[PDB]
Structure 1
Amino acid sequence: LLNMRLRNISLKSEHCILSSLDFQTSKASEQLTKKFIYPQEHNSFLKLNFQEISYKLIDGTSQIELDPICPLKVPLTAFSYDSISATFKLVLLPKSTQPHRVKITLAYELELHPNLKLPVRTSWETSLVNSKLSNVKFKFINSNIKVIKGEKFTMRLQIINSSSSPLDLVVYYNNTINPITLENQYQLHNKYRKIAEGIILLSNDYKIPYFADLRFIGIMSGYYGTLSGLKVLDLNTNELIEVGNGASVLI
């Protein structure tokens, strides 16, 4: 009851859940010690946090922070430190423990000594393109973020199919404007315009035959996150697989 603490956990896409703990001197404790300190004419407190650490599991391992941290001391403040946990594909929820050491130094070198230790579970409170029909999956083997200029470049698809008939699909980019509140109308027009002529495929209408190298050239500068022009058509039972993957900046 001197510094209220909370922990926030987020799930990054790079298979590393990041959990950040936040500490803040609570206002009720602030006024509680503040009137008794201002009786002796003190305006700013001094809670010296000298040893803050987090532990892992039933065997105690000290996972470090993401940056440096000295031994600080301040009043009426808040500070947050972020550790990087490991992403779990199973349903084993990791339970961690944190500990601090607040030295509540009253003045003229007459200090008290306080320590605290919480322990709880680091929950989070709740791409590979796959089709809807068959076993056919898509994933770009080369790193989906890429930094290019407006020059010629290459990109690499990959197909994991049912081995019964691996062939009979075609790719094409469809360089035409999709046929569409004037402000939202023109915003959707600018999205559909810079999609339809931003990059151009240097081999479209292209029969596939488990790799498939397909080659572009990029014209217009900008970050094309989930570049969604190219559209792999499946010949038999005529439907379309969108490929919402890959993101190329062109600067």
Structure 2
Amino acid sequence: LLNMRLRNISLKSEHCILSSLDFQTSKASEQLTKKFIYPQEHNSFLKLNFQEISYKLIDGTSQIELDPICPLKVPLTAFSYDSISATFKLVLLPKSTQPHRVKITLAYELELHPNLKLPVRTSWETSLVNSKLSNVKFKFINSNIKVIKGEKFTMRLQIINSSSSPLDLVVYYNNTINPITLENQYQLHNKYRKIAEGIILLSNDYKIPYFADLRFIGIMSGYYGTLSGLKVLDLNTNELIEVGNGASVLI
């Protein structure tokens, strides 16, 4: 074995988990072979890695990678092509057969037949927030990453619960500073002074009765990921329910 490699599959909750095996012909056989080649007056080898594709299942299909693969042949390089893989709905882990081939055109144009094709198990190795009191769940129908200027915009929230008491929630945005190491002492304040100053909710204390279009305008600009001021609350048995979801860039 010469080309040392690793299998990296990264898991995302946008129903995607990409795969990019990294390869690098490391020093272990290089320290011997590039001194035999140094005795034979060569220090720029070229193993023509040009043929490589993946396999998904028993239907061994070449999945279309997100990146390209031309004739890659140089000395001491290292490559990691990224391939889009569909994320499963559960722990159905598709074992995979990583196939590759490099035709080792050595010094004095000496080709050598070699390939790197083997199989393993391609495990990854690892919107909505639920309630605390009721069966209520909160999601935003409009997409949680959205573009706007400093002007007005429409924002829309899902309320789905059990219809045993299907009512009496209230919103309020609570535009005041949470009053709160010295650089962290002026970091938590500058977090809170742009939470409570950025957007303003133009219909607060909105009685809900499912669907409601909540009404904001934002003043100053930035990335308001998990815009966390707004609090709905159940008027019986008052618990501070929070919706820490959604985002808004203002450029």
When the two structures are superposed, what TM-score results if normalisation uses the length of structure 1? 0.97
| Aligned position for 1:224 | 224
Deviation at 1:109, TM superposition (A): 2.2
Identity of aligned residues (%): 100
Deviation at 1:114, TM superposition (A): 0.5
3-state SS of the aligned residue for 1:177? Answer: coil
Kept after mapping to 1: 8 A contact 2:51/2:101: yes
1-side partners of 2:120 and 2:132: how far apart? 40
Runs of at least 5 residues in structure 2 that lack an aligned partner in the other structure: none
2-side partners of 1:106 and 1:152: how far apart? 66
Superposed CA deviations along residues 10-33 of structure 1, whole A, max 9, x for unmatched, are 112211111111000021111121
* Divergent runs of 4+, >6 A: none
Deviation at 1:118, TM superposition (A): 1.9
Mean alpha-carbon deviation: is it higher for 67-76 or for 182-191?
A: 67-76
3-state SS of the aligned residue for 2:82? Answer: strand
Q: Which has the higher strand share?
A: 1
Deviation at 1:240, TM superposition (A): 1.4
**Inter-CA distance 126–68: structure 2 relative to 1 (3 Å threshold):** closer
Superposed CA deviations along residues 95-117 of structure 1, whole A, max 9, x for unmatched, are 11111111111222221110121
Superposed CA deviations along residues 184-230 of structure 1, whole A, max 9, x for unmatched, are 01000000000001000000122111211111001110010000010
Deviation at 1:48, TM superposition (A): 0.9
Report how many aligned residue pairs link the two structures: 251
Superposed CA deviations along residues 1-54 of structure 1, whole A, max 9, x for unmatched, are 110111111112211111111000021111121111111111111111120111
3-state SS of the aligned residue for 2:140? Answer: coil
Kept after mapping to 1: 8 A contact 2:57/2:96: yes
Runs of at least 5 residues in structure 1 that lack an aligned partner in the other structure: none
Deviation at 1:180, TM superposition (A): 0.4
3-state SS of the aligned residue for 2:29? Answer: helix
2-side partners of 1:28 and 1:91: how far apart? 37
1-side partners of 2:124 and 2:59: how far apart? 23
Deviation at 1:126, TM superposition (A): 2.6
3-state SS of the aligned residue for 1:147? Answer: coil
3-state SS of the aligned residue for 1:194? Answer: helix
3-state SS of the aligned residue for 1:50? Answer: strand
When the two structures are superposed, what TM-score results if normalisation uses the length of structure 2? 0.97
Kept after mapping to 1: 8 A contact 2:67/2:83: no
2-side partners of 1:199 and 1:173: how far apart? 9
Deviation at 1:164, TM superposition (A): 1.2
